[PDB]
Amino acid sequence: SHSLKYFHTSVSRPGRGEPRFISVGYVDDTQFVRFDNDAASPRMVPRAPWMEQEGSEYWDRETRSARDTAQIFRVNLRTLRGYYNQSEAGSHTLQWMHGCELGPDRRFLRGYEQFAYDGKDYLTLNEDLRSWTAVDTAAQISEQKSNDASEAEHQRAYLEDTCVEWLHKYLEKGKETLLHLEPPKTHVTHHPISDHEATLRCWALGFYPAEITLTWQQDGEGHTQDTELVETRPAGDGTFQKWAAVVVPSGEEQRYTCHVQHEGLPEPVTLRW
């Protein structure tokens, strides 16, 4: 299973003219490109090592796609402004994301595409990829404009043929990395809270992909975690980190196990401290 997703963001700026436009591309949990109409070089540019051996032909085209999207989105922000009867003074956000996913066979499993205005679902592309559906009541005129114009087809073509095709080329270019599973380095830390209790915190460091799951269990096992769990976070070197903590009665530490589940480990590791 692999995916190729892009995230597009356009933010209006009443004062400073043209709204900011940003695009980032990912292959699974690895960002490989980006575009920013506000940086030194508007260009789609490389953001992963395995993308520095590409020619002008590639960068010019993607740059063209990013720039065209930006211009349309400029127009769309004025349009969306008219729909919510919002004044020209405030700043607003138009978001667009699209992606294709492969199944194990390595072939097209599914595709997706949706727009959002000011952080809310606006227009979504149907599961079969053959028509649109307004998710926000205010997006209904866009749904018809779009279905009548038959715009889903060009998106479906892209999601099934182009996206998938390139997802394959990308995995091949960055195989050394992209296909390698990096399991987590693990351990449980002990942090006394008082003379009665103490927090048991299980660590998972430097793993990839991001998906992982840590589960505390002690043991007359009614339920039951009540665990403090932080959002899986990026180490900054391409890998991820996470931990799950609980409060144990002092002396009762050892009755606790932390189960670590991830793709890169031949099977789940169990931690006790």
Binding site: S23, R61, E62, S65, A66, D68, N76, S142, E151, Y158
Partner: peptide, 9 residues
């Protein structure tokens, strides 16, 4: 590559 076409909302 990214979608070469988008929607005019």
């Amino acid at each position: 590559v990214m979608a070469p076409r988008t929607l005019f909302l």
